[PDB]
Design a protein around this ligand. Structure first.
Ligand SMILES: CCCCCCCCCCCCCCCCCC(=O)OC[C@H](COP(=O)([O-])OCC(O)COP(=O)([O-])OC[C@@H](COC(=O)CCCCCCCCCCCCCCCCC)OC(=O)CCCCCCCCCCCCCCCCC)OC(=O)CCCCCCCCCCCCCCCCC
Ligand SMILES: CCCCCCCCCCCCCCCCCC(=O)OC[C@H](COP(=O)([O-])OCC(O)COP(=O)([O-])OC[C@@H](COC(=O)CCCCCCCCCCCCCCCCC)OC(=O)CCCCCCCCCCCCCCCCC)OC(=O)CCCCCCCCCCCCCCCCC
Ligand SMILES: COC1=C(OC)C(=O)C(C/C=C(/C)CC/C=C(/C)CC/C=C(/C)CC/C=C(\C)CC/C=C(\C)CC/C=C(\C)CC/C=C(/C)CC/C=C(/C)CC/C=C(/C)CCC=C(C)C)=C(C)C1=O
Ligand SMILES: CCCCCCCCCCCCCCCCC[C@@H](O)O[C@H](CO[C@H](O)CCCCCCCCCCCCCCC)COP(=O)(O)OCC[N+](C)(C)C
Ligand SMILES: CCCCCCCCCCCCCCCCC[C@@H](O)O[C@H](CO[C@H](O)CCCCCCCCCCCCCCC)COP(=O)(O)OCC[N+](C)(C)C
Ligand SMILES: CCCCCCCC/C=C/CCCCCCCC(=O)OC[C@H](COP(=O)(O)OCCN)OC(=O)CCCCCCC/C=C/CCCCCCCC
Ligand SMILES: CCCCCCCC/C=C\CCCCCCCC(=O)OC[C@H](COP(=O)(O)OCCN)OC(=O)CCCCCCC/C=C\CCCCCCCC
Ligand SMILES: CCCCCCCC/C=C\CCCCCCCC(=O)OC[C@H](COP(=O)(O)OCCN)OC(=O)CCCCCCC/C=C\CCCCCCCC
Ligand SMILES: CCCCCCCC/C=C\CCCCCCCC(=O)O[C@H](COC(=O)CCCCCCC/C=C/CCCCCCCC)COP(=O)(O)OCCN
Lengths: 105, 318, 175, 115, 113, 347, 83, 171
């Protein structure tokens, strides 16, 4: 099934490309380097069955970084409430939001 | 302000194509011990205007057996692609500055073949079909070798940006470093433009008019303009790639004059070659490209990868 | 919402896919695949992938040229079919267009799980990076790492290409 | 944005040229004028009949050789790595493999057109 | 026969030597420009941090104003279990601004030619 | 075909399978599948004729569709978790697509139609390769991703494979199609126990491979592809027909022969979980495979069919090429039951 | 040694293109292992500062690390100016 | 999941360096030679804390150092610096190579007036050391406590009791 030839010989045929937190050229980091690093360090050595339960928080944070579902949900809720408030006419939106802001370097 | 730049690029190119027709006719005439157009307009200077006016006031034909949509689409694609291929050329500043200009030219050039393919197929006549299949064979002959030559030459540029070629050749022309690649590239651009001795898609003696035998008036004139624009553009690309003019940032007019002169010299060389030689057989072009150019090109690609590492002469801009 | 450029390009991508998947005739199928390759190059370019988009466009242009030659040689008939010359092809094309439009309406006016998960829209600009660093292109560095990190990949790929040449010669030998 | 505008401008100019060509002059189309051209005599068969390709093997080999172009394009960037020995070894390995494939197809009469 | 080959080889060698000299000079120039960028980087990092924090604070105050009507909305609530800093998604910095700024922040660099 | 080229193609097939078996990266597993298919296509076409070309085309279409679904499942899994390592397959839709792609590669029902056709269209050596070596890579992947399997889907496909193998084999007079339907049923048995114990899957695969190798080698030794041509073998070499009869009885699963060992073991494993109805159904269905094996044994060894005159000439000549591993294969196919506990060495 | 000379002459007389291709490829293969400037190319590649050099925290026991960019410690590029 | 702590707007105010990129590039080498210590302190804080909210005072100090540097440059070599950065600013790529006379004049002025030496090639890219009283953060990732592993395998291996114990087999 799986003959771990790489582990037996210490060859590293393809392990260099399995994860995003592993030695990129010019030390360019992945967008979710810290989340994946934390999940991997949590789940290391305890097996898949235990990791699926005891590292659920780190994995949830990693998935949130990857796909950003809750962030878009929260942004959409804020935008919807703001649009309703302005339609009713009670919003009174600020100048910086409208592009009249005093930019800083 | 950008639309003004687009217009000031594309209208002068069309005028240059129109008068390149006259220049080619006169050069062929004087190399054939005759004169050429010298009646309509002084020294034939009004001949292109008369040709264009005649072609656009002539009835265009829609063949009964033809597929009309592709039949009309093909010349539009040809002319638009020919005009678009000019936008990343630095003279000394490009209209569009691309990180990978060379790859953009490669992709658009390999797209331009479908104009001939679809016009020949949609004409629904035998000579047009033969011309289109000859176009298929020609592309299969030249494409791989052209790409490898481009990569081998650009291994000294450091990137695929066309402007960097100006700084790469600040002191010496690239032809002094890669003249075998320059020769093979010149022959490959002759083949890529369907120019003699590789004008097989038209094949006047063999196929009457070949792929455009059913086209008349304005749609035919459009194919003509696209072809001559491709001639000038490919020679300008060769001039930028192998004979780099010196650019003074406070006087770009000098660079523009130098580059235009080199382009005109290469285009006149194209006309000279057409006037000088007979035509290949289209299997012989494939054999020349795959049995002589390809092995030498592979060896030279190996050499041009090894040489900068050997001499510690790697270019910048990873 | 911002200019809808990515959404328009992906819709044209799906339209070209429907064009060649209804299978009118390999000439028009090749045209549809070329259109899809162009819009896919545009989509990838809009995400910062210039090299990959240009490469895929070039490769599919060469492939479709070979396919055109093979269609002229071996996949022709007296009357080639277009999308409006046959009821099966037209029905498949219209069904694909309506399926795409229905899926777009479903995912745009509502936020429901079609097959995998839900989606609200907001334009693809939201999930971008705002990363501010570099004198190099990251995609270029990753692709160039094939010759220093991907030695195994280079070995298997080169062996596969040589084997493919031998294989096509063996298959077409005939006898 | 600028490239899209340039493409639109070029396509619009070509389309307007076609429109002018088809709407300005006088048209007199009849059946004999629009018949297919075969040098003055009516064609025997149809142009949609199968047309034999004598270089099909070369076309398939071109498909295979086109992907090595994509493999070798990143070499200018690959030449900037710290481990130049591995990169040079792998680039020469790929080019030698391509040359060996060309030699194999050449020696087995694969580049000869069918008769 | 011999003369032409010799002349071509000599031309190639002269070009190789000239290109070697020029490429080494260009490498030194690139190193100098990179060093200038390295010298300038810390100030850019400081201003970038201040810009990001200011945009986040403005968004926080505007959301606190907007979302007080609803019953069960904690203002400024995170979406992550971890309490460490997370880089903003840029839909969070430009979410309440005009589409011109959004376009410039998203496609500005890609479309600049 | 040149012997050098044939050796290179066989080595490339084996290298693709080995790359699937040793890889930790999903991309390398997919590459192994691609390389295996690319080298396998010409091997099926070694003896060129229209039937071989048809079989190769059908095989290519099936395997290319399966590989496209495989890659899409990999990409979906990457999208929902930025992981390339072959592991518990974090997404269920991707896992369903992966299971369907691997089942299509294996020829499990209802993606079973191509197996009898491809087996009938090729030579006996190509059939041996296709029905023995080509099962290793998909089964290895399935063993690696077994913990994330959905038992309902795999058990449904396994039961369907057993039923369809028996019913289809009941109708055949061509030996290659009989072997193909037998292969379908045995793949069903192999995949029925996979979610519970991969060691039992490996044991069943090994015993099936041994019996299939013995069967195909005996069929190559006596140049028979139909029942009627196999019914002549008794008048030329009765020892071959007797060994074939015992091997068929073993493939039928009768004790005390070795072919009884996997089913027995699998049944026991299924009763260690609850799983009572499914093993009973599986055994009662395997009775159909036993029936058509017994019919073949009736035709070839237990009765004597009429022969022809020219057979006398064949009496004067001996078999030139000899298979060195045939006796050991026959012995391992028949007399291995008493060494059953050695299966502990498989895990 | 004598038959191969005739073979080389015949190849030069019948297929000069292939002779030149093989000679160029062999030179490109074997020359880089015999050149002393390959390591110079490696050093030049390593001396290009793409990323920011993150300073190390002073624990008081690193006399080989400079306290300032102009300090005598640290690597030198003086070899590069003479190239 | 808890609320996010953000600094007030008043805390984010600081005197700004409002010179264009050409001006910054023209003085980049001397700026990195003179203001090295606060910049290195800020960068060490930034890479150790991994949080922009914890290195605000270091950023303010960096701005103050840059302001002092530019005030001195204005005080002693206004005109040569203006000529040099105008030369740099005309270029589309902002190239050092095309303006060496103006750079030479600016270098001479800064050397004579302030004793400033332009760094040599490869000096600004060195990895340096910085002395700080800021304690090294212990959990910059805000990591949770790691789960305990499965204990271990211990003891000597003995033959299986009564063999395989598989059905009727006695071995
Ligand atoms: C929902 C969206 C649907 C999209 C529709 C596509 C647009 C074309 C529709 C108009 C064409 C039909 C008119 C016609 O046939 O003759 C009319 C009329 C009837 O003539 P007739 O003698 O009485 O009878 C003719 C026969 O009945 C039979 O005549 P026929 O043999 O010519 O019929 C074939 C024709 C008939 O059409 C059909 O069969 C059904 C139409 C559906 C086609 C869509 C398939 C999908 C293909 C890929 C996706 C394309 C983009 C779609 C997205 C659009 C939104 C942006 O189909 C085509 O040829 C398709 C050509 C359009 C594709 C353009 C691609 C350009 C290639 C450039 C390279 C790409 C670079 C990379 C990117 O004749 C004319 O008036 C002159 C010809 C008109 C040609 C004008 C320009 C060409 C078409 C416009 C292209 C616009 C592209 C932008
Ligand atoms: C020259 C021969 C020689 O040197 O004899 C030394 C050797 C001395 O060994 P021993 O310790 O004195 O024997 C003690 C008793 O014989 C009794 O020894 P044990 O109590 O240790 O029994 C050994 C044990 C483990 O041994 C075995 O499993 C293999 C025995 C072969 C099974 C018989 C099948 C065909 C004969 O056998 C079993 O567990 C019984 C399972 C047998 C059923 C196999 C399943 C197939 C169904 C029937 C068809 O004599 C033999 O090996 C006996 C002849 C065989
Ligand atoms: C050996 O004999 C032959 C020749 O020699 C005598 C030829 O010339 C020859 C080539 C054909 C010639 C007669 C040249 C014909 C000239 C063209 C067909 C006309 C092209 C001119 C216009 C269409 C260009 C556009 C006109 C505008 C003025 C350009 C500006 C555009 C506006 C929008 C502004 C052939 C094929 C040949 O066989
Ligand atoms: C036991 C049987 C042996 C023979 C059968 C072998 C079958 C496999 C074929 C080749 C063996 C594969 C082993 C090579 C794996 C490559 C990786 C390893 O070698 O390390 C590389 C060492 O590279 C070396 O140059 C070795 C590669 C050269 C391979 C020569 C080609 C041989 C292939 C021939 C057979 C393959 C198919 C047939 C094609 C002709 C990279 O090291 P390095 O770059 O320091 O560090 C990388 C880490 N970084 C990025 C952080 C810096
Ligand atoms: C270089 C590229 C850019 C150039 C920029 C200018 C682009 C020019 C536009 C392109 C067209 C050029 C051709 C111009 C010739 C006219 C063609 C057509 O428009 O005229 C007639 C169009 O008219 C139609 O036949 C019907 C008449 C109008 C239809 C009524 C529609 C409702 C509009 C309301 C009209 C009320 C008054 C309008 C003023 C306010 C067609 O008649 P037809 O004979 O077949 O075609 C051949 C024309 N001939 C005779 C010259 C040879
Ligand atoms: C100072 C001494 C110089 C030493 C140079 C190195 C050795 C040079 C000689 C090596 C071989 C030279 C060429 C081969 C011998 C002669 C040619 C030959 O074999 O026959 C020609 C015949 C071609 O003629 P036809 O097409 O059959 O003609 C049909 C119509 N009558 O050749 C062939 O059949 C096969 C040709 C295979 C070409 C090889 C493919 C390309 C490989 C070269 C690319 C770069 C190689 C670099 C890597 C190698 C490094 C050592
Ligand atoms: C001026 C009056 C305008 C009338 C517009 C009519 C348009 C039309 O389709 O008519 C068909 C018209 C004339 O036909 P007839 O009826 O025979 O002649 C009439 C004269 N008595 O035919 C044409 O000329 C076709 C016009 C060209 C279509 C222009 C738009 C097509 C767009 C092409 C897109 C594809 C571009 C490909 C390149 C892009 C790739 C980057
Ligand atoms: C057809 C194929 C079109 C290919 C266009 C390629 C243009 C290009 O390469 O320039 C890339 C350019 C600049 O990027 P960089 O060079 O990497 O540097 C930017 C950082 N300073 O990127 C862009 O501007 C992308 C913006 C536009 C995307 C292109 C969209 C074109 C899509 C074509 C679809 C055609 C219309 C659909 C109908 C099909 C035909 C009927
Ligand atoms: C110190 C280390 C250096 C490494 C070595 C580098 C030096 C190598 C020297 C050799 C390089 C020669 C390059 C030439 C490439 C191709 C030459 C060739 O042999 O091609 C010919 C044919 O090539 C052609 O003649 C081309 C045909 C098309 C002709 C079109 C017009 C002619 C060109 C006019 C002038 C063009 C000027 C080129 C450069 C222009 C400026 C850029 C093959 O055809 P046959 O003679 O029939 O033999 C094959 C069967 N055995």
């Amino acid at each position: 099934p799986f003959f771990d030839v790489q582990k037996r010989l210490g060859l590293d045929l393809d392990r260099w490309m399995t994860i995003q937190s592993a030695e990129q050229p010019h030390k360019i980091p992945g967008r979710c380097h810290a989340f994946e690093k934390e999940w991997i360090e949590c789940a290391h050595g305890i097996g898949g069955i235990r990791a699926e339960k005891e590292c659920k928080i780190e994995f949830d944070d990693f998935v949130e970084c990857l796909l950003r579902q809750k962030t878009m949900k929260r942004l959409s809720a804020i935008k919807r409430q703001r649009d309703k408030l302005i339609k009713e006419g009670k919003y009174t939106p600020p100048p910086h939001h409208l592009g009249k802001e005093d930019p800083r370097p | 302000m950008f639309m003004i730049n687009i217009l000031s690029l594309i209208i002068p190119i069309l005028l240059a194509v129109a008068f390149l027709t006259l220049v080619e006719r006169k050069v062929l005439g004087y190399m054939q011990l005759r004169k050429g157009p010298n009646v309509v307009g002084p020294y034939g200077l009004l001949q292109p205007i008369a040709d264009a006016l005649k072609l656009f006031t002539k009835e265009p034909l829609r063949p009964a057996t033809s597929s009309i949509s592709m039949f009309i689409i093909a010349p539009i694609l040809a002319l638009s692609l020919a005009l678009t291929m000019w936008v990343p050329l630095p003279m000394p500043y490009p209209l569009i500055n691309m990180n990978l200009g060379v790859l953009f030219m490669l992709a658009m050039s390999s797209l331009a073949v479908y104009s001939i393919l679809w016009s020949g197929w949609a004409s629904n006549s035998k000579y047009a079909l033969i011309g289109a299949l000859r176009a298929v064979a020609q592309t299969i002959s030249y494409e791989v070798t052209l790409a490898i030559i481009l990569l081998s030459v650009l291994l000294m540029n450091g990137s695929y940006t066309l402007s960097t070629l100006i700084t790469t050749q600040e002191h010496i022309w690239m032809i002094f470093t890669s003249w075998p690649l320059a020769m093979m590239w010149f022959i490959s651009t002759l083949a890529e433009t369907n120019r003699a001795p590789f004008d097989l898609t038209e094949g006047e003696s063999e196929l009457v008019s070949g792929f455009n035998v059913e086209y008349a008036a304005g749609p035919f004139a459009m194919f003509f303009m696209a072809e001559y624009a491709n001639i000038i553009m490919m020679n300008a690309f060769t001039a930028i790639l192998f004979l780099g003019a010196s650019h003074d940032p406070h006087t770009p007019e000098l660079y523009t004059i130098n580059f235009v002169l080199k382009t005109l010299a290469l285009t006149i060389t194209f006309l000279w070659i057409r006037a000088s030689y007979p035509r290949f057989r289209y299997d012989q072009l494939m054999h020349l490209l795959w049995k002589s150019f390809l092995p030498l090109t592979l060896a030279l690609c190996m050499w041009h990868i090894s040489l900068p590492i050997m001499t510690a002469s790697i270019p910048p801009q990873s | 919402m911002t200019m809808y450029i990515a959404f328009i390009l992906s819709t044209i991508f799906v339209i070209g896919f429907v064009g060649f998947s209804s299978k009118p005739s390999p000439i028009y199928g090749g045209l549809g695949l070329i259109v899809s390759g162009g819009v896919g190059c545009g989509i990838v370019l809009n995400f910062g992938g210039s090299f990959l988009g240009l490469m895929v466009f070039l490769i599919y242009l060469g492939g479709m040229l070979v396919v055109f030659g093979y269609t002229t040689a071996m996949a022709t008939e007296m009357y080639p079919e277009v999308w409006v010359s046959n009821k099966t092809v037209f029905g498949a094309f219209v069904s694909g267009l309506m399926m795409e439009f229905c899926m777009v309406y479903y995912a745009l006016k509502e936020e429901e799980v079609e097959i995998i998960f839900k989606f609200n829209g907001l334009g693809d600009w939201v999930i971008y990076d705002t990363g501010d660093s570099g004198f190099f292109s990251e995609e270029a560095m990753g692709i160039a790492a094939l010759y220093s990190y991907g030695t195994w990949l280079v070995i298997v790929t080169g062996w596969s290409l040589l084997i493919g040449v031998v294989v096509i010669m063996e298959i077409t030998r005939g006898n | 944005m600028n490239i899209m505008l340039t493409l639109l401008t070029n396509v619009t100019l070509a389309s307007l040229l076609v429109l002018i060509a088809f709407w300005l002059p006088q048209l007199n189309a009849y059946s004999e004028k629009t018949s297919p051209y075969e040098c003055g005599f009516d064609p025997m068969g149809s142009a949609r009949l199968p047309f034999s390709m004598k270089f099909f093997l070369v076309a398939i080999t071109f498909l295979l050789f086109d992907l090595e172009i994509a493999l070798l394009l990143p070499l200018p960037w690959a030449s900037q790595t710290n481990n130049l020995k591995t990169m040079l070894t792998m680039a020469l390995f790929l080019l030698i493999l391509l040359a060996a494939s060309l030699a194999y197809e050449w020696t087995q009469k694969g580049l000869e057109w069918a008769e | 026969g011999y003369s032409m080959f010799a002349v071509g080889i000599g031309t190639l060698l002269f070009g190789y030597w000239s290109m070697m000299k020029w490429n080494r000079e260009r490498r030194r120039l690139q190193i100098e420009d990179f060093e200038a960028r390295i010298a300038l980087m810390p100030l850019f990092q400081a201003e970038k941090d201040r810009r990001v924090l200011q945009m986040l604070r403005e968004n926080l105050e505007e959301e606190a104003i907007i979302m007080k009507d609803v019953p069960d909305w904690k203002v400024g609530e995170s979406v992550f279990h971890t309490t460490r800093w997370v880089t903003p998604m840029m839909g969070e910095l430009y979410g309440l601004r005009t589409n011109e700024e959004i376009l410039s922040a998203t496609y500005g660099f890609i479309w600049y030619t | 075909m040149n012997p050098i080229i044939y050796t290179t193609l066989i080595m490339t097939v084996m290298s693709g399978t080995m790359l699937v078996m040793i890889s930790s990266h999903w991309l390398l597993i997919w590459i192994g599948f691609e390389m295996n298919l690319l080298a396998m296509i010409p091997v099926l076409m070694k003896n060129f004729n229209p039937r071989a070309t048809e079989a190769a085309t059908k095989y290519f279409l099936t395997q290319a569709t399966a590989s496209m679904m495989l890659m899409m499942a990999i990409i979906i899994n990457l999208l929902y978790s930025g992981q390339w390592t072959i592991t518990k397959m974090f997404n269920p839709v991707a896992m369903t697509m992966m299971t369907m792609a691997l089942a299509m590669k294996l020829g499990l029902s209802p993606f079973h139609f191509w197996v009898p056709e491809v087996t009938q269209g090729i030579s006996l050596q190509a059939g041996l390769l296709l029905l023995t070596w080509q099962k290793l890579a998909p089964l290895s992947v399935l063993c690696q991703i077994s913990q994330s399997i959905n038992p309902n889907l795999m058990l449904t496909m396994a039961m369907l494979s057993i039923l369809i193998g028996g019913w289809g084999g009941l109708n055949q007079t061509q030996l290659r199609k009989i072997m193909a339907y037998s292969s379908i049923a045995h793949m069903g048995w192999m995949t029925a126990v996979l979610p519970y114990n991969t060691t039992m899957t490996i044991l069943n695969l090994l015993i099936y491979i041994t019996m299939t190798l013995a069967m195909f080698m005996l069929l190559i030794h006596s140049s028979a592809t139909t029942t009627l041509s196999l019914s002549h073998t008794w008048n030329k070499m009765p020892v071959i027909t007797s060994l074939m009869m015992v091997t068929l009885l073993s493939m039928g699963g009768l004790p005390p022969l070795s072919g009884f060992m996997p089913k027995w073991m699998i049944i026991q494993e299924m009763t260690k979980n609850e799983s009572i109805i499914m093993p009973t159904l599986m055994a009662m269905t395997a009775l159909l495979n036993l029936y058509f094996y017994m019919r073949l044994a009736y035709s070839s060894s237990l009765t004597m069919f009429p022969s022809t005159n020219n057979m006398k000439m064949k009496w004067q000549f001996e078999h030139t090429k000899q298979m060195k591993l045939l006796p050991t294969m026959i012995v391992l196919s028949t007399l291995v039951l008493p060494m059953t506990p050695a299966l502990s060495s498989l895990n | 040694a004598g038959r191969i000379a005739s073979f080389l002459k015949n190849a030069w007389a019948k297929e000069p293109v292939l002779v030149a291709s093989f000679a160029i490829g062999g030179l490109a293969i074997i020359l880089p292992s015999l050149s002393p400037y390959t390591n110079y190319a490696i050093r030049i590649n390593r001396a290009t500062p793409y990323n920011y050099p993150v300073p190390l925290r002073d624990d008081g026991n690193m006399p080989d690390v400079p306290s300032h960019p102009q300090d005598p410690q640290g690597p030198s590029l003086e070899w590069l100016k003479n190239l | 999941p808890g609320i996010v702590e953000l600094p007030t707007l008043e805390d984010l105010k600081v005197q700004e360096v409002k010179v264009s990129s050409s001006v910054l590039k023209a003085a980049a080498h001397h700026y990195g030679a003179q203001c090295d210590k606060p910049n290195k302190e800020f960068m060490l804080c930034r890479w150790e804390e991994k949080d922009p909210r914890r290195c605000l005072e270091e950023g303010k100090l960096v701005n103050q150092c840059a302001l002092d540097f530019f005030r001195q440059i204005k005080r002693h070599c206004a005109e040569p610096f203006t000529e040099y950065w105008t030369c740099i600013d005309y270029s589309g790529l902002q190239l050092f190579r095309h303006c060496r006379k103006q750079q030479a004049k600016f270098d001479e002025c800064v050397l004579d007036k302030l004793g400033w030496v332009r760094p040599d090639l490869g000096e600004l890219s060195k990895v340096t050391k910085v002395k700080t009283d800021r304690p090294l953060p212990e959990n910059p990732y805000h990591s949770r406590a790691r789960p305990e592993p499965n204990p271990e395998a211990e003891g000597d291996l003995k033959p299986a009791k009564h063999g395989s114990r598989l059905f009727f087999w006695t071995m």
